[PDB]
Structure formats: structure tokens, C-alpha cells
């Protein structure tokens, strides 16, 4: 039952920035181990016994601490450092792990490229109608999507999903899907997908009318 509180939970650092991650324990532990996990890989020992660099880890990393306060440090952030870090303790059983630090790459802001799509003719054979909105290659990750039916917000029946930071351009993408009953979809003709982000305050709205096109 040693509780490992880790911080921060998520963060973005520019290439070259100094980064510090802390792990605070419920009770004294003799040492703290640190593990690294990149998307697609299993967790890999990063730091052994509080301050020892594990095989395959570069010299920009280091750890320190004792008792109930430990930290891990990257002197200069590299893009390949992007990953999830976990502090771990084994001085008392059971061995416990921190909640993790998701470390992302910071890059230039980018407004989301927004695209809206109406239900397909194929889906209209069923009793449901889904409108899909794609908000892609944006930065930073925090983003809000609003679904307006006839200029009037609709909440829930929505399915939202995010990609992980793109490996080539460091941006994020997000899909939103509004699934309505087919009959309710045909009682309303204006469908809007509204994105509020960080470019400006109000922005990015894409729409389509049920009355147009076929």
C-alpha cells in the first residue's frame, strides 16, 4: 500500500527544455525506480535505484531524492523522450507504481482543420443517422467540440475520440460523431460542428444543410 503520487500528470516541453517529474510516496521507500513507455512499446527500465541510468538510456536523464520525495530529470528535452514515465517502488510489498507522467512535445500552435460529413445513404437503411466531424492536425491538445442542430446545441449521443500526438508533425486530431435516430435527423436540416480552441475566441464552424445535395 505505499501510494505513489506523481506529477505533473501530463505536460509538453520544447526541444531543449529542462524537465522535472516528481513522485511522492505515502511512506518512506528505500529507492525509486523509473520506467519509460513509448506508444507501441512495453514499459522499459529508465532509472534504477533512484539515480542509476539503465542500459540504453542517454546521459541527459537523472534521478534524485530519498525517503518520500523523488524526481526524474531530463537536462535537455529531445523529441524521442516523448512518452509516459512511471515511478515505481519495491521497498514494501506490494510493489506499486505512480499514476504516470505523459510527456508530450511542445510545437507551434495550429488551428484545427475542420471537416463535416452527413450520414451516408447506406446508413439510412437502418434506424440511425450519424454526422461525423473531423478536427485534425491541431495544437495544443485541449479542444472543445459543440454539435448544433438548427443552431441549437445537442448534448450526448456524441462519440468523441482523440489520436495520440502525431509522430511526424507533433499535432493532434479528434473525431466527433453524433448519432441520431433517423426520423429525428430528417426533422432538422442545418447541421453544425463547432470547434473552440486557441487560434481565436469563437472560430471554426463547418456546416451542411439536409435540403442541399444528393
Amino acid at each position: 500500500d505505499i501510494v505513489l503520487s506523481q506529477s505533473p500528470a501530463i505536460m509538453s516541453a520544447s526541444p531543449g527544455e529542462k524537465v522535472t517529474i516528481t513522485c511522492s510516496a505515502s511512506s518512506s521507500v528505500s529507492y525509486m525506480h523509473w520506467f519509460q513507455q513509448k506508444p507501441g512499446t512495453s514499459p522499459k527500465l529508465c532509472i534504477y535505484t533512484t539515480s542509476n541510468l539503465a542500459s540504453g538510456v542517454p546521459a541527459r536523464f537523472s534521478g534524485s531524492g530519498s525517503g518520500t520525495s523523488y524526481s526524474l530529470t531530463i537536462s535537455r528535452m529531445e523529441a524521442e523522450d516523448a512518452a509516459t514515465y512511471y515511478c515505481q517502488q519495491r521497498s514494501t510489498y506490494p510493489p506499486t507504481f505512480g499514476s504516470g507522467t505523459k510527456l508530450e512535445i511542445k510545437r507551434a500552435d495550429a488551428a484545427p482543420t475542420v471537416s463535416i460529413f452527413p450520414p451516408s445513404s447506406e446508413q439510412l437503411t437502418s434506424g440511425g443517422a450519424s454526422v461525423v466531424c473531423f478536427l485534425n492536425n491541431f495544437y495544443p491538445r485541449d479542444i472543445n467540440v459543440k454539435w448544433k442542430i438548427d443552431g441549437s446545441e445537442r448534448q450526448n449521443g456524441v462519440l468523441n475520440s482523440w489520436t495520440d500526438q502525431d509522430s511526424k508533425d507533433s499535432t493532434y486530431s479528434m473525431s466527433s460523431t453524433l448519432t441520431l435516430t433517423k426520423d429525428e435527423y430528417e426533422r432538422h436540416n442545418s447541421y453544425t460542428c463547432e470547434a473552440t480552441h486557441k487560434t481565436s475566441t469563437s472560430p471554426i464552424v463547418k456546416s451542411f444543410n439536409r435540403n442541399e445535395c444528393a
Binding site: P94, F117, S120, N136, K168, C213
Partner: protein
């Protein structure tokens, strides 16, 4: 150097016992500690337990009395047995060895298998409904974004390709969402508007558990 490999089912029914095998190549299990760790949706990790070089075991108190770990030294394998699994035992299960050193060398290392995603649910095999996402209009800019909607499938996973792999740089496939026992995913692809609808673009959707082969060029409308 060493190699650990998770072997077992991907989907289990609630109340059933979950059974997995960790096969160790590169080193004997007659020395050291051999464990099972799991990663939950939301990414917290939980140390499940171990089986020692002597066959002794340690089980996390959090796995109450449900977990047991066995081994076969004359086959270099160790096994996990987790009884009465609810939907919340859904995770990726990894076998692994604690940090150590070895041979000669200066550095501490450890060994992890690749992990196996385990789904706990009572759903049945359901092919996905694959729909085309084409814009309902367009005058300008240089790019156009089209996509596909893969809805109501079970279980994971699904695979999506665009024009058999020949479209890649502008692709985004989004993680699957579990809704009312069924999974739904979407994918997008952005191409130059002088390529579409002039030159065909197709989504190749495949669903392994229900042998689905879906191709659907996205056509205007």
C-alpha cells in the same frame, strides 16, 4: 537478449477464468523472479504478482484470492490464472522480470514481453457497418478530407488502410470507442482536390474476428 512472450485468448466472458502463458526464451526461470503486470484503460499499471525461481509465489492483495501463478520449468513457461473476471479486468497483460544486471556489464536492465490486450465482455462477434464519408459540398482550397465510419463492431480490433497503403501521409485512424457493447471507429484521409474526385480513393476496412473484407471508394454525393 532475453525474450518474453504473452500467449492466450483476447476475449473472455465475465465470471470465466482468464488464462495466460508467459514463455521465456533466452534465460531459465530457475533463477530470478517472474511476474505479471497489467495496464488499465487510463494507463495506470498494477503489479499483479510473481512466481520465484523456487516456485514460491507472491500475489498482490488487490487481486484478493482470484489470482494464481504456476510454472513449467522443463518448458520454461509460467502461467497466470485469474478467476471470475468482470468487464473491469479488461487490460493489456504483460509478463516481466524485475530489474537486475547480468553476465558481465555495468548496467541494470529488465525484460518485458510485448503484452496482450484482453477484453472482458459478454458480446458476440459482430462485423462492422462500414460507411463512406464524402463532403456534401466544397470552390476552394488545395486539399480535401474524406473518410470512413466503422460502426457497431466486436471485438477489437479493426484495421483501416487507404488505397491499399498507397495513401499514408495524410491518414488519421482514430481509437475505437466502446458504445452500448459495440465498438465504433472512424478514419480520415486528406488528399489534394485535383486528385479527388478525379482519381479514386478507397478505404480498406478489415475485421479479423468476423473475416470482413470491405472496400468502398469514396464517391461524391
Amino acid at each position: 537478449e532475453v525474450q518474453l512472450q504473452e500467449s492466450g485468448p483476447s476475449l473472455v466472458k465475465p465470471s470465466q477464468t482468464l488464462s495466460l502463458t508467459c514463455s521465456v526464451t533466452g534465460d531459465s526461470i530457475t533463477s530470478g523472479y517472474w511476474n505479471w503486470i497489467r495496464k488499465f484503460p487510463g494507463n495506470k499499471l498494477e503489479y499483479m504478482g510473481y512466481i520465484s525461481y523456487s516456485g514460491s509465489t507472491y500475489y498482490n492483495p488487490s487481486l484478493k484470492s482470484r489470482l494464481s501463478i504456476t510454472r513449467d520449468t522443463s518448458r520454461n513457461q509460467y502461467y497466470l490464472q485469474l478467476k471470475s473476471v468482470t468487464p473491469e479486468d479488461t487490460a493489456t497483460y504483460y509478463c516481466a522480470s524485475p530489474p537486475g544486471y547480468y553476465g558481465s556489464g555495468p548496467y541494470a536492465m529488465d525484460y518485458w514481453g510485448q503484452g496482450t490486450s484482453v477484453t472482458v465482455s459478454s458480446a458476440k462477434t459482430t462485423p462492422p457497418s462500414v460507411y463512406p464519408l464524402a463532403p456534401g459540398s466544397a470552390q476552394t482550397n488545395s486539399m480535401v478530407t474524406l473518410g470512413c465510419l466503422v460502426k457497431g463492431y466486436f471485438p477489437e480490433p479493426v484495421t483501416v488502410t487507404w488505397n491499399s497503403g498507397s495513401l499514408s501521409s495524410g491518414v488519421h485512424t482514430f481509437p475505437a470507442v466502446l458504445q452500448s457493447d459495440l465498438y465504433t471507429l472512424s478514419s480520415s484521409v486528406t488528399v489534394p482536390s485535383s486528385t479527388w474526385p478525379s482519381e479514386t480513393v478507397t478505404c480498406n476496412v478489415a475485421h479479423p474476428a468476423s473475416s470482413t473484407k470491405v472496400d468502398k471508394k469514396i464517391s461524391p454525393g
